[PDB]
């Protein structure tokens, strides 16, 4: 098979910055094609036959290369270019894609807005207790979350989930869910979510006490 390897797997660029990504092939192919994929939705033909832009693709995009080395270049990064780009050879079976370059955009650092939520009475009725914390609209993506229960750091029981970069503002968001039994939840009072982000040396701290609601 013709094996396609893309570098870098993931990259970020500030707006107006020049972007280049490469596609290396295990042995020469005559033409390379490119697909743009947003949010794991249906891929859009971007560049076909090495250098031709598909209908509606902006002129800031260009494809080049020959043989075993191909590239796609964006002369000036824009917000709407945030996507995963796949190269694709259709000249020999099996038809193959590279592993993608995930292209993100830089923006100004932004502090998360942190919100904490007690277990709902409906959940408690069922024997379970989830404490929820949102860390929303921050940049850059790196961020630490800590849980404290009556002042004591809690490790087991936490599940974290991060969104893809936001389409209106280029920030990231994160959900952190601490699941305990209702019995243990009912054994303690102070539930605290602490966010540590580069935008401050001080963690953002949000709490509630069960016995207040």
């Amino acid at each position: 098979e013709e094996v396609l390897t893309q570098s870098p797997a993931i990259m970020s660029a500030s707006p107006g910055e020049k972007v280049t990504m490469t596609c290396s092939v295990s042995s020469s192919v005559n033409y390379m094609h490119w697909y743009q994929q947003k949010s794991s939705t249906s891929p859009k033909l971007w560049i076909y036959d090495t250098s031709n832009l598909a209908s509606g693709v902006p002129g800031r995009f260009s494809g080049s290369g020959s043989g075993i080395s191909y590239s796609l270049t964006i002369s000036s990064m824009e917000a709407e270019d945030v996507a995963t780009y796949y190269c694709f050879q259709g000249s020999g079976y099996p038809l193959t894609f590279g592993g993608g370059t995930k292209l993100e955009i830089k923006r100004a650092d932004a502090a998360p807005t942190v919100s904490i939520f007690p277990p709902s009475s409906e959940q408690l009725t069922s024997g379970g207790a989830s404490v929820v914390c949102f860390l929303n609209n921050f940049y850059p993506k790196d961020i630490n979350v800590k849980w404290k229960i009556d002042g004591s750091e809690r490790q087991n029981g936490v599940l974290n989930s991060w969104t893809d970069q936001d389409s209106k503002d280029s920030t990231y968001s994160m959900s952190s869910t601490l699941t305990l039994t209702k019995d243990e939840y009912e054994r303690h009072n102070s539930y605290t979510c602490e966010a540590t982000h580069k935008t401050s040396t001080s963690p953002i701290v949000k709490s509630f006490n069960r016995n207040e609601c």
């Binding site: 249906s42 894609f97 929820v132 599940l159 609601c213």
Partner: protein
């Protein structure tokens, strides 16, 4: 106005069969080669099968991953291509797409149909409304939440006010634990809009034929 629409996806058990359909609009179907592709979640796209036009009798070709298990067929009168799958396994889990090609290029794709191959039990979600304990640190704003827990398979569809509330929403990818998913979503509105106006989390889970609505209630007066 070329259109391609895959249907047929769903959850099935290892060793089951499933047939996928792809109906097409806006081109003369019989004059083009047609393909199925797939993408496992978090992974690159994969070409898996092509059927040539009625005249070729070059016939069909397959990726080795599916060869001798899957069959591509076409019905030109129905302007449709099919993927009969058999002997399914867990690594066949993917969104499946049909594509038309011209020359070396796959020019038009469908929206995708999702197939999960799993022995895990279909389970309807529990849907919990999350009422704030406090307004946001800046003003002026409040964040509400919805927690959706203990369901299988993906996906759920979550909206806020039946989709009229679209701005300021963050819906997080589901995370799998012990054959069950949990997902959450937040909405941020101006403090002057809530709780004076009603906000409701709506969760559809088609696999379990359920649709649950949950109003967010303010904790106090």
């Amino acid at each position: 106005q070329v259109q391609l629409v895959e249907t047929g996806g769903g959850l099935v058990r290892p060793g089951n069969s499933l047939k996928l359909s792809c109906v097409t609009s806006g081109f003369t179907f019989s004059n083009y080669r047609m393909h199925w592709l797939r993408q496992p979640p978090g992974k690159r796209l994969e070409w898996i099968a092509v059927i040539t036009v009625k005249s070729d009798i070059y016939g069909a070709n397959y990726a080795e991953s599916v060869k001798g298990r899957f069959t591509i067929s076409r019905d030109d009168s129905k302007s449709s291509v099919y993927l009969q799958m058999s002997r399914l396994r867990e690594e066949d889990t993917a969104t499946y797409y049909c594509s038309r090609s011209r020359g070396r290029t796959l020019d038009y794709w469908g929206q995708g149909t999702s197939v999960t191959v799993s022995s895990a039990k279909t389970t309807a979600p529990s849907v919990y409304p999350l009422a704030p304990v406090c307004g946001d640190t800046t003003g002026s704003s409040v964040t509400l939440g919805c927690l959706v827990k203990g369901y299988f398979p993906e996906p759920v569809t979550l909206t806020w006010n039946s989709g009229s509330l679209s701005s300021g929403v963050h819906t997080f990818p589901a995370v799998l634990q012990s054959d069950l998913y949990t997902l959450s979503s937040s909405v941020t509105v101006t403090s002057s809009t809530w709780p004076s106006q009603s906000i409701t989390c709506n969760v559809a889970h088609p696999a379990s034929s359920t649709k649950v609505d949950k109003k967010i209630e303010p904790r106090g007066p």
